Ligand binder design. Structure first.
Ligand SMILES: *SCCNC(=O)CCNC(=O)[C@H](O)C(C)(C)COP(=O)(O)OP(=O)(O)OC[C@H]1O[C@@H](n2cnc3c(N)ncnc32)[C@H](O)[C@H]1OP(=O)(O)O
Ligand SMILES: *SCCNC(=O)CCNC(=O)[C@H](O)C(C)(C)COP(=O)(O)OP(=O)(O)OC[C@H]1O[C@@H](n2cnc3c(N)ncnc32)[C@H](O)[C@H]1OP(=O)(O)O
Lengths: 177, 177
């Protein structure tokens, strides 16, 4: 399962074969990922990433979540995913991160747009949501460029780096009729 | 486990012994509950309520959710609960409903306040949230009387009664220091 993004980019569904490369990518970025994600601190050994992946693959096959790996000229560059899918509401919560050396190239912006369009077209997701610290300006720029509307500010909603942070909730509705 | 509310009210932790009475209460109110809750339509037989209860009791014991039954002069009057608890964020999502014949007496308002105070005092929950259709004025009045702040409006976020509804997100932070 591959969702095309561009002549140099593609989304591949999470595989057990990706575990090794992804573990290294996580290691290389966890110091800075920790400021806006919670799970990187619990990742130490490859076994823990494999665990996260096998679990994700299941929710992925059942349609309860999705995990895609972003590939740039056959090189793993980051992860784009639906952390949770509420089938009855056709709503999904988005999560993503990019290896620091693949940033600043519009890679995530384009991947998100290709991913959303694909699901709005299939029709099982029409409402997309992005929740992230209010102060993560890079993620906010990805959401706005993808036409997300800020719905609210959740006060001190997430505990990250020994402190509570206000979280913005961005959403976009796409009815691909 | 009983959390006191008033000389005529109390909160009792969900029990297997409550299943029968609760099933009847659900039956008596599901026609109208369906307009703002999704699970009442899946409840037909007592076995299904027992299922919902045994599951809840587990999340309750693990601290991942809570389910309390509201009792009014030893008579079951409704349910008040934390649908989900995010331990790391000390945040909880509230759910509640009252049998139609126990409404209009400030019973839910008082029960919610007693419940929140008890958890903010214990310190494992400091952020309380209420999400419900924007047009449910009775629930909105319970949230405002309990000093919740409206954080945002989630567009067409819930599918209920064959249609999508805008959902308000109310929140309150309590640091019982
Ligand atoms: S809490 C939920 C959010 N997750 C995280 O915060 C995870 C940690 N952060 C990241 O991994 C990272 O900061 C993310 C993926 C959020 C954003 O990274 P980028 O800023 O690299 O995003 P993107 O890959 O979309 O690149 C946009 C930027 O690239 C430049 N640029 C050049 N060319 C383009 C094109 N053609 N299209 C769009 N952008 C392009 C811009 O300088 C950057 O754009 P901004 O305007 O978004 O700053
Ligand atoms: S989607 C998440 C919300 N859940 C649901 O909507 C579930 C379905 N609805 C209900 O079960 C029900 O409508 C709920 C529980 C939301 C609200 O019911 P009540 O309106 O009966 O609330 P409560 O029990 O808090 O009673 C308040 C009302 O009672 C009157 N009243 C008399 N005396 C008092 C006192 N002492 N204190 C407060 N209220 C009191 C008021 O006439 C009603 O108050 P409002 O001002 O809230 O309308």
């Amino acid at each position: 399962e591959i969702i095309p993004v561009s002549t140099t980019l593609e989304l591949r569904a999470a595989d057990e074969s990706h575990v090794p490369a992804l573990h290294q990518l996580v290691l290389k970025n966890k110091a800075w990922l920790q400021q806006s994600l919670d799970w990187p601190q619990y990742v130490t050994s490859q076994e823990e990433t494999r665990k996260h992946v096998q679990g994700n693959i299941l929710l992925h096959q059942r349609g309860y979540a999705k995990m895609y790996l972003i590939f740039c000229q056959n090189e793993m560059a980051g992860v784009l995913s639906f952390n949770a899918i509420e089938p009855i509401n056709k709503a999904a919560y988005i999560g993503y991160w990019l290896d620091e050396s693949f940033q600043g190239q519009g890679i995530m912006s384009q991947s998100l747009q290709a991913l959303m369009t694909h699901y709005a077209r299939r029709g099982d997701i029409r409402r997309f949501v992005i929740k992230c610290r209010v102060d993560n300006q890079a993620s906010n720029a990805v959401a706005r460029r993808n036409h997300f509307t800020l719905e609210g500010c959740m006060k001190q909603a997430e505990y990250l780096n020994g402190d509570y942070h206000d979280v913005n909730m961005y959403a976009r509705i796409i009815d691909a009729d």
